[PDB]
Amino acid sequence: DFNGKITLAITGASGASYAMRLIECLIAANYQLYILCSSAGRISLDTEVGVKIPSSPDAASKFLTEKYQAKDQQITVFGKEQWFSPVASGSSAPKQMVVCPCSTGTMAAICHGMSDNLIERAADVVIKERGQLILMVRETPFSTLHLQNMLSLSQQGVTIMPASPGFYHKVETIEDLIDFMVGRVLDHLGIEQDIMPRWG
Amino acid sequence: DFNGKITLAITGASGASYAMRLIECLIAANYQLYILCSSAGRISLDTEVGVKIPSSPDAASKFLTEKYQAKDQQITVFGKEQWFSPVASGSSAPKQMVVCPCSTGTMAAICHGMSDNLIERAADVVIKERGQLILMVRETPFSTLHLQNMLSLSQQGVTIMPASPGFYHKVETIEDLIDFMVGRVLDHLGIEQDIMPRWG
Amino acid sequence: DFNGKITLAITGASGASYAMRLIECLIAANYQLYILCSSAGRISLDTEVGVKIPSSPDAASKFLTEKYQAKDQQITVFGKEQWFSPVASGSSAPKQMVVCPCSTGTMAAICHGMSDNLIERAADVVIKERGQLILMVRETPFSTLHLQNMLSLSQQGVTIMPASPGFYHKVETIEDLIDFMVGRVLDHLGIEQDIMPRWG
Amino acid sequence: DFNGKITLAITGASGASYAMRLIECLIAANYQLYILCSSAGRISLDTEVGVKIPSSPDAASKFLTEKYQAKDQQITVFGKEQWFSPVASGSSAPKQMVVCPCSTGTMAAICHGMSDNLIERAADVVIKERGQLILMVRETPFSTLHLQNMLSLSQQGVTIMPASPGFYHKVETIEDLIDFMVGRVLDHLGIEQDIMPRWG
Amino acid sequence: DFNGKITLAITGASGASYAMRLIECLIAANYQLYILCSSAGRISLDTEVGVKIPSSPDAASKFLTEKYQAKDQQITVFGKEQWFSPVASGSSAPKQMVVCPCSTGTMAAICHGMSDNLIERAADVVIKERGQLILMVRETPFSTLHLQNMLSLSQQGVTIMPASPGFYHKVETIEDLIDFMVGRVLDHLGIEQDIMPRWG
Amino acid sequence: DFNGKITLAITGASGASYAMRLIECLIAANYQLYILCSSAGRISLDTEVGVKIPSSPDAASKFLTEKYQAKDQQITVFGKEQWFSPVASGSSAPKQMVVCPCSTGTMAAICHGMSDNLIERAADVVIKERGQLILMVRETPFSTLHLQNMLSLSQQGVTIMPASPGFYHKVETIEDLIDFMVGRVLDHLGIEQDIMPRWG
Amino acid sequence: DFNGKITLAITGASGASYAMRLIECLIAANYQLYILCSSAGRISLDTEVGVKIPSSPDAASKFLTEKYQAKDQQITVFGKEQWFSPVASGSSAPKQMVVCPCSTGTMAAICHGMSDNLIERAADVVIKERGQLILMVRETPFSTLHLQNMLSLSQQGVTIMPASPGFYHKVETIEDLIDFMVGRVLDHLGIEQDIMPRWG
Amino acid sequence: DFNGKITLAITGASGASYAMRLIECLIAANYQLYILCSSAGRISLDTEVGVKIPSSPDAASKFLTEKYQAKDQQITVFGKEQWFSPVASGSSAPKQMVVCPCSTGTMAAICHGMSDNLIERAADVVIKERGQLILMVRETPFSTLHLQNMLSLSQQGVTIMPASPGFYHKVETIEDLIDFMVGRVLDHLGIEQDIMPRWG
Amino acid sequence: DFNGKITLAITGASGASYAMRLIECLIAANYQLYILCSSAGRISLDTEVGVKIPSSPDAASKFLTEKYQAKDQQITVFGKEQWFSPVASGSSAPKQMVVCPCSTGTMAAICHGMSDNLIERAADVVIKERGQLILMVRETPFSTLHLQNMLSLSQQGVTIMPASPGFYHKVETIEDLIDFMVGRVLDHLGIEQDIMPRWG
Amino acid sequence: DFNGKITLAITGASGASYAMRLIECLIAANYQLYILCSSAGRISLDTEVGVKIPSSPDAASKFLTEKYQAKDQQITVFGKEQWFSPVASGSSAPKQMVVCPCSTGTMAAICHGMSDNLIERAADVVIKERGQLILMVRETPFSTLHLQNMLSLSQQGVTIMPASPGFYHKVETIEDLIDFMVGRVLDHLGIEQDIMPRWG
């Protein structure tokens, strides 16, 4: 008895911390998560935050389940070519999906409809079902070609959310900046920011 | 005998720290600066970082000169409607200009050619002279209309550089993230990153 | 314990009566209102309907509160440059906003992302959050440039609702025509037309 | 010896009163009128204002002639498929045509060149002769597709005049609002507003 | 008993002399003028040609009336926010308007429909009434964004007339070059060049 | 040992004086010039400024060499169909070319890639090599079709520089206006304005 | 044993003679014809050339069969709403269709995919099967909207063939002008012009 | 004392008879004509109708003057490169110009702004002055590229009038078909069809 | 009794050898050729391969006939302004045309519909008849404007075939590279590569 | 102490010889090279020119170093998924990159921002840093879709340089044709052609 199901995709764009905080807040918000991680996403998590997700999808699910202390079936990891997954079909796919962080190469593939891996096929499905797809892009600067990619998607209802946190405080901390972006994701997903737990 | 002249514009987009670090690095790089600050830019600097720029352009120049310990004529502040300034003419305007941070409302005015204040007129001049204009946008998400604004400018040679720093370290610090963006500005300006001084 | 929060903006386009009836119906529907009025909006209200809104935002809130007999905190007026207001941030801004009536100059500024006053910044925020923005345009004829403005916004999900009431009765009255437009606003906002009170 | 010839088309868009006042003012201005009324236009006139135009074009001409007390040949009604009419040819068609009110379905047909009835063929002719076609649209809101229709026509020189009267008075009356729109039609047609007669 | 009414707007684009000669020729042609001058327009007139227009609209009207020796009511100056002026309404606005000279920032505002001052609202009105608006642009070079602005307006029937006089003589004089542009304005307005008086 | 090589093209657009002053300043700046003159360019030079360029390219080179007192090989004129010239090849063509003045017919041919004479082929070459092409257009008004031509070229990196000099002085002289445009050309070419010699 | 099957549609555009000569030449070329005639097409044939096609499709087939002396099954007329006809299906429809003459209203319907009668559905079918559709337009002038219609179709492979015969002779005759257009149709259909029989 | 001045251009598109009838009707209507004929136009007139226009512009003027019995100065022929002609300047050029007939190659040059001969420069001038240019195109079929050419011009206010006469009679004659097109030209020029003289 | 008729055009783009090999293979394939050569095409043939085509079209036909040993009427050369040629009419023009090699200036003229010489008129004819036009472009790099030219033509069915031979062998020879391109032309023309004769 | 750093990418498009000559000339010009080779690039080098690059990046660097006799660190090969390479970051990536030869599939991926291998990520980086990317395309013909790809990139500043060498000599050799293209690459890179060594 979860409050919703969300697809979470993690790519390699140097914003692993955002992804990890997102998952924590979504677990606390009592949502069911289907988690997809690219090759580069996995390696980013290790390098940036020391989280070593097993490549085996079963052992990966168990791993995140214990990390975050999640409920039975609350977290399921699917593999990069596991095309039988619920996220690959209009029928069983969550109506909300976040790509956090999102590389411009993945964003481009999504823009053009390439569907060369599970992340890209899941996004394609959310778009054809007129669901809610949030791409938390992490790249700078933005070339002309990537703005044309972004513009396309945006016109088609996808939320382009660059990881560009504001500095709203007098002494800013890395936790404020991560939460700035994560609370705005939750805001877009319709989930209350009051459920976000303490960092300490 | 400075190495170059650059126009620096500061708007209110919650990224004051980036602007302050930029100025420091540009002073250290031995460039001449012409500094423009919007109303909201001034108030942002006070709130976010406790820098209280006098509104008087003369007293403002002196103020930043002492703050950063700059050379005679190294820093000159111009006022929001001082249309006689060197930045308002093709003849005397620096060929490089950075807007750091850049609100989307200022970016929109620049995109459409509005020139309603000195920041917008200076940008307009850099664009017609086919100079180098770098807009360090700080906003999220990016609406469709603002991506169309960004795309226009980008197609016209303006560098759209969202303030989206990468997390390249194992324990990230607010100084790494500021420098991530500032070193990339300097990279685009053709200035060596080796001149950036210590934070302590 | 209100049923919702809505932003109401009033510009000068000669349709003050529509705005005044809207507010009445929204108060009766038990919504919380954040009210923005441009310079020309204020002067329009005086000329067209003899409503003299104090320019002071506090005294303006009190004034409308007594006029319409609203609940504590049910009506708050914000000032044209009060950038700290809840409507200027994605986090705290109502997800529904109506501009009633809407000048084409304000509509143009919104279309292009100009954000030169609080009305324009509030609209910009509703659009980037993919909220519901209803512009009740009052202008005729519609130039080519203003149709391109309207078309842009419409494509981006904004409801362009010209103040073009139908004549559905045998003896039409000015109250029928105002309500024609106001009931259609309420229809779009998802509020029941049965709550609209008697004119007498 | 009339001052001009104008084509007047009436569709069903709930603005019959505007059409009836227009005809009165044009008769008083001493113009020759060729009147076209769609099926829905006829039924609108009955419902909204109790004017029962005979479907027979001859008896319809006589009827309006007596209603408005017009001069011999001052008013001629043509039928929905009478393709031999002067309005269906470049040679004999008035150079000014007003569609009052104008449904969006008729406007769409005109935009796309469909010419499926006499109204649409007459408009097509005014457009190819680079005459003056005024469409007094009565619809709200304006969908995206209908703004693209409007924009096309406007770019091609057609005057899109939504029936969106302004409230310029202290106690507005239904007669002021009708005249607001009708005087603006006359303004566009180059006819003096001083000839508009009293309502009483 | 004047031959016509024209709106004349003067902006700051360094072409004050053209404006002053235009007014002289239009007075001599016996037209009624409504004159609008921006802030920068006023300061340009002082600097470039020593004409010090009082900012008070009444004293400004009187001033130009005596300067040029014009007939009662032949010249009326309106103020930058006097929104009750005849030029701000479709009903009473001249069907011909010249902006001489025209800054690109004003041209941009007109292109996008901004209407932030009386000049921009007057232009907006001429465009929606399908009048004749002549923009005598004075700027070089023309950026890409400003050509897109110009192209829009031109497509919408506005005459883009850069102040680019030809050198048609063997010894050219500053008076020949001013008249080159002014006679071409008069040519577009349908006024005879034979009425232009002697410079001496 | 010249400081650079530039291609200079002269067309018939009534701005011969600008061309003649340009050449003088470029000779003084110690650049090597390759000069192209159209049929109408030659006749313009005679009529407007009494410079009678021999049509023979050899005698034309000698002629300008003596006129301006240039160094051996400093000035070479090529003929309208001499397709073996260095300006007709990517390999040997200067990377900077100015068309001064530039007719709209030549500009159109350049925009569309027509290459029907040497001027048009030289421009085509500068554009494909991504060199610097400056078109000093002299025409007014600018039709819609010519703005589309200009816009194309501008988007493709060509500097559209209408001959629209500003009036920056209190008593303007024809020499100030010529230099206004010529100093701005030199500004774009990266050549110091301090080298421009006295007129007397 | 015919050489091919062609669909022939006749609309009302005042070019009945062309249609009648086409049919004659196609019968002589030994093609099988499926003939469609609109309401206005039928009336045009009577008025312009005294050919009174019965509205009954069976009696119409017999009628044309005797007129032109055609072979059993060589000519079959289908009715305006007979949706079971072979021309309404991809499977059984001729791959070549000519609309001769073609009204702009029919052309518009075809351009937009309206399929409101058999002519329009047959054309729609030829286009989706990537067959050969030839529209012999007869209209002048061509409005902007109708050129956009024509351009669309042309881009999509439809042959826009205005009935604009050339005057290639010294004494031109109405028969030369009809044949000019008909021989060019046959040229496009791949049928030899040598089979066209004598007029006398 | 003529009623107007018109520019008439004749190209080679096989419609010489139309041109010759036009001139006759315009002479009878008492207009002043400036006549331009291309190389191919001249040869077309000889071949198609036995009119041998001398290539010398003076002897050509005299020739047409006697042919049509025109008044002193009523007909003046200008030569293909006589750039001093009144039709080559905004100041002295007729505001109405007809190209009859018009080749698609000339139309293309006009569309793109090429101005390679006097016909093309005259058209360019009418377009920049926002005059009335009527192109009586004679070509079939219309390729895609030529419809894009036509569409451009049409959007820019040029009347594309293919030589596609209707068959409005029971026995059509070559004179009816020529007049069909010529009366429609006169209709567009605002000249009464009653002045067209007898053929016999 | 030839197998087909093809139009071959040779321009100056430094690829004369390709043209000469093409002709040889087409003669061997037993096709009838109509050969067009521009001014620059002729000079290219002399310089690059020592083939001196007489400018006289009759002597040129005879010359190529003997060179290649062709059959009576197998090769006919037409002159650059011989407008009576079969290639200038829809009726008699080959349905296949190759421009080998093709300059970008000729390609541009074809793209825009200029038809200023016989090559350009022949191409225009193949395009309007929806024939097969193959442009073997020889230019590098490809500017933006020339890619827009190429893209247009390609979209309109023209085969853009840059002369970019592949290196498919271990020791490549100039004959392999010529044939690479020529066999691909023949492939597109539907002619068997087995008929290509030995080089020796 | 090299003169510059360049990224060289080799794909499979049958132009291996060009790549090998490029490397030689760049080594001789004393530039530092970072070399990327696709799977198909490697196999092309073996087949076409017998160069067997080891797939191991270290052994590949050593191999090319000895082949060309390069200086320590002068040549470094990176592997197809080695994402830590200097070419994958804005900070350390050469500002000049050549893809020689370039397949259309790689070009398409670059156009759309796909970044699926190191070549595509390196190009993406040069484009976002507004560096110099030269694509030496080798393909014929160019489909419509690939011209749209090329056009995009070109508009965004990428140099599309088809491998289309000119035949500038009397007896052409395969070495002349390779150098034609390689000298033009060096020309674009700003490197002197005088440093290119002898083939023998």
Residue numbers in the entry:
A (entry chain A), B (entry chain A), C (entry chain A), D (entry chain A), E (entry chain A), F (entry chain A), ...: 4 to 203
Please give the exact wording used by the authors of the publication that reports this structure:
In prokaryotic organisms, several ubi gene clusters encoding a set of enzymes (UbiA, UbiB, UbiC, UbiD, UbiE, UbiF, UbiG, UbiH, and UbiX) produce ubiquinone from its precursor, chorismate. The monomer structure adopts a typical Rossmann-fold topology comprising eight α-helices (residues 19–32, 42–52, 60–71, 89–91, 107–115, 121–132, 147–159, and 177–192) and six β-strands (residues 8–13, 35–40, 78–81, 99–103, 135–140, and 162–165). The crystallographic symmetries of both crystal structures generate spherical dodecamers with dimensions of 105 Å × 93 Å × 95 Å. The monomeric structure of CpsUbiX is stabilized by two different patches of inter-subunit contacts, namely patches 1 and 2, to generate a dodecamer.
